[PDB]
Scaffold this active site. Structure first.
Site, PDB file in Angstrom:
ATOM      1  CB  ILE A  71      14.984  37.915 -10.033  1.00 35.65           C
ATOM      2  CG1 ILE A  71      15.726  38.816 -10.989  1.00 35.65           C
ATOM      3  CG2 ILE A  71      15.852  37.489  -8.871  1.00 35.65           C
ATOM      4  CD1 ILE A  71      16.051  40.164 -10.358  1.00 35.65           C
ATOM      5  CD  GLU A 160      10.318  45.945 -13.106  1.00 32.47           C
ATOM      6  OE1 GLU A 160      10.000  45.927 -14.304  1.00 32.47           O
ATOM      7  OE2 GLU A 160       9.488  45.662 -12.245  1.00 32.47           O
ATOM      8  NE  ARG A 163      10.185  42.535 -16.696  1.00 34.55           N
ATOM      9  CZ  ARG A 163      10.055  42.125 -15.435  1.00 34.55           C
ATOM     10  NH1 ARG A 163       9.990  42.995 -14.439  1.00 34.55           N
ATOM     11  NH2 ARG A 163       9.912  40.832 -15.178  1.00 34.55           N
TER      12      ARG A 163
HETATM   13  N1  ADE Z   1      11.067  38.707  -8.730  1.00 36.94           N
HETATM   14  C1  ADE Z   1      10.955  39.538  -9.761  1.00 36.94           C
HETATM   15  N2  ADE Z   1      11.800  39.475 -10.810  1.00 36.94           N
HETATM   16  C2  ADE Z   1      11.690  40.358 -11.799  1.00 36.94           C
HETATM   17  N3  ADE Z   1      10.718  41.229 -12.019  1.00 36.94           N
HETATM   18  C3  ADE Z   1       9.905  41.273 -10.954  1.00 36.94           C
HETATM   19  N4  ADE Z   1       8.835  42.105 -10.808  1.00 36.94           N
HETATM   20  C4  ADE Z   1       8.302  41.794  -9.583  1.00 36.94           C
HETATM   21  N5  ADE Z   1       8.947  40.850  -8.959  1.00 36.94           N
HETATM   22  C5  ADE Z   1       9.977  40.524  -9.811  1.00 36.94           C
END
Ligand code: ADE
Length: 246
Positions: A71, A160, A163
């Protein structure tokens, strides 16, 4: 572009939003039947735009880097906000160019800096879809301390969840009640690069990992993942971070 509206959101439509988000991310290859994300994409094509609408129908638009699901920033009404890091700054060249002002958040986008700014580690911040609703509402009116905790909810319930199927499940369980993430959710979040690297390295090694990854499982115990036969590989991880980018 993908879109989610929290009014009417139930575990099922959420499951569908997370399937479309994965589906919108480009890949040319599948390693052990998991999508391998591209090493680099050029320019504007490097960013997916998600429209999130909270229960009252207000929206923020989040820009995600399609090569690693990160992001980069978001637009709320007429203002774009971007993380304080080089990649987010590059992203500002391609997205939300229409915003009347651009604000660089005091911190960069990784979990360490975000937990420092928010005040809590993310294992004490409740996530769920009521917490995503809350997060959208926060991000609509700038406050950088409040934005850090809201952005921690936002990352975990979208990027997340794309994923790992386990985190998507976890958020489906918290569709009407937030609850802090299990330690298995924190472990998995933290292992995506590692896991991605070893599944790609396993390819020329009979599906065996050159170095095994240790995770906490559901029941909170340490567990060593050593080859692609593991349930983490067969069922749980959904997108692989390309080795070129680890
Ligand atoms: N900014 C971000 N966007 C997505 N996954 C992440 N994991 C850690 N920071 C993140």
């Amino acid at each position: 572009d993908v879109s989610f509206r929290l009014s009417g959101a139930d575990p099922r439509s959420y499951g569908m939003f997370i399937k479309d988000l994965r589906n919108a991310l480009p890949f040319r290859e599948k390693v052990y039947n998991i999508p391998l994300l591209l090493p680099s994409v050029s320019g504007a094509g490097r960013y997916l735009l998600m429209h999130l609408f909270n229960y009252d129908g207000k929206t923020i638009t989040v820009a995600v880097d399609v090569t690693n699901v990160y992001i980069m920033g978001y637009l709320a009404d007429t203002t774009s906000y971007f993380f304080n890091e080089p990649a987010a700054e590059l992203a500002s060249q391609y997205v939300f160019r229409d915003a009347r002002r651009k604000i660089t958040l005091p911190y960069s986008g990784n979990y360490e800096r975000l937990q420092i700014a928010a005040g809590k580690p993310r294992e004490k911040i409740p996530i769920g879809l009521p917490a995503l609703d809350s997060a959208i509402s926060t991000l609509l009116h700038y406050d950088s301390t409040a934005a850090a905790g809201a952005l921690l909810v936002l990352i975990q319930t979208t990027a997340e969840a794309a994923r790992f199927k386990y985190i998507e499940q976890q958020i489906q369980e918290r569709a009407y009640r937030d609850e802090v993430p299990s330690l298995a959710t924190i472990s998995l979040e933290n292992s995506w690069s590692g896991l991605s690297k070893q599944i790609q390295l396993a390819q020329g090694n009979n599906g065996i990992f050159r170095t095994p990854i240790v995770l906490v499982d559901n029941k909170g115990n340490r567990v060593q993942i050593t080859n692609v036969t593991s349930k983490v590989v067969t069922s749980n991880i959904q997108l692989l971070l390309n080795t070129r980018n680890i």
